[PDB]
Amino acid sequence: MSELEKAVVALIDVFHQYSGREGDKHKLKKSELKELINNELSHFLEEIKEQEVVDKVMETLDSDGDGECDFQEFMAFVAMITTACHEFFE
Amino acid sequence: MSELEKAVVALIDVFHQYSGREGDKHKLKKSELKELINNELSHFLEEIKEQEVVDKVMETLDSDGDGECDFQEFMAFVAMITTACHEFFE
Numbered sequence: 001m002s003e004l005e006k007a008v009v010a011l012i013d014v015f016h017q018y019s020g021r022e023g024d025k026h027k028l029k030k031s032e033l034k035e036l037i038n039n040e041l042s043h044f045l046e047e048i049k050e051q052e053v054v055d056k057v058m059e060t061l062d063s064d065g066d067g068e069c070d071f072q073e074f075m076a077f078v079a080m081i082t083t084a085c086h087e088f089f090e
Numbered sequence: 091m092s093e094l095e096k097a098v099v100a101l102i103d104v105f106h107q108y109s110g111r112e113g114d115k116h117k118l119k120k121s122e123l124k125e126l127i128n129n130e131l132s133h134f135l136e137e138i139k140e141q142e143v144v145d146k147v148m149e150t151l152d153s154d155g156d157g158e159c160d161f162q163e164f165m166a167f168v169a170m171i172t173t174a175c176h177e178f179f180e
């Protein structure tokens with residue numbers, strides 16, 4: 001597969017590596033989202049060390065209000081992070 | 091870097107491999123978008139062989155109406171493709 005398809009595959013895989021840890025295996029709860037950011041986005045986002053930051057990130061990306069981040073909400077988060085990186089440089 | 095960061099990097103790179111071919115080097119015109127889909131998404135999207143399909147895809151993703159796909163519009167397209175794949179399986 002192409003580099004773009006490898007990226008799509010990796011996005012799906014990372015989501016599940018974190019969503020499938022606890023509770024609803026199809027969504028990210030706060031602790032899963034914190035670990036995803038801290039382990040997988042260390043070059044793009046500041047490490048999260050405070051509950052208030054976890055809470056604010058989840059609040060910002062939880063579009064449907066159910067308290068967790070589903071796959072569509074995760075992809076919107078990825079788009080936001082990627083666009084912010086691009087805008088930093090361009 | 092992590093697998094997620096490699097994916098972010100690949101998304102930026104593929105965009106530029108296609109946007110930087112012709113005209114505005116920061117946006118995808120129709121021909122650049124067609125080649126991106128045909129060369130890089132052959133496992134996820136049907137090959138485009140008709141002008142009418144090119145036109146419809148651009149119309150659908152060109153949120154700001156300027157006739158080209160910028161980086162933010164491309165990331166929305168990636169999110170849409172990735173979410174559609176996920177929903178096919180889940």
Ligand SMILES: CC[n+]1c(-c2ccccc2)c2cc(N)ccc2c2ccc(N)cc21
Binds near residue numbers: 013176
């Ligand atoms: C069955 C869907 N699906 C896919 C999946 C497979 C193929 C394409 C898209 C997603 C998946 C893909 C990866 N990498 C990691 C975990 C899961 C997963 C985990 C749980 C579940 N209940 C469904 C899951």
Ligand SMILES: CC[n+]1c(-c2ccccc2)c2cc(N)ccc2c2ccc(N)cc21
Binds near residue numbers: 086106
């Ligand atoms: C200067 C921005 N920037 C980046 C870039 C570099 C680092 C981070 C994000 C984007 C870039 C990254 C890749 N892979 C391929 C092409 C370009 C590119 C091409 C043209 C341009 N005028 C700016 C460009």
Ligand SMILES: [Ca+2]
Binds near residue numbers: 018
């Ligand atoms: Ca979970």
Ligand SMILES: [Ca+2]
Binds near residue numbers: 064065066067069070
């Ligand atoms: Ca939600």
Ligand SMILES: [Ca+2]
Binds near residue numbers: 109122
């Ligand atoms: Ca161009």
Ligand SMILES: [Ca+2]
Binds near residue numbers: 156157
């Ligand atoms: Ca546009």
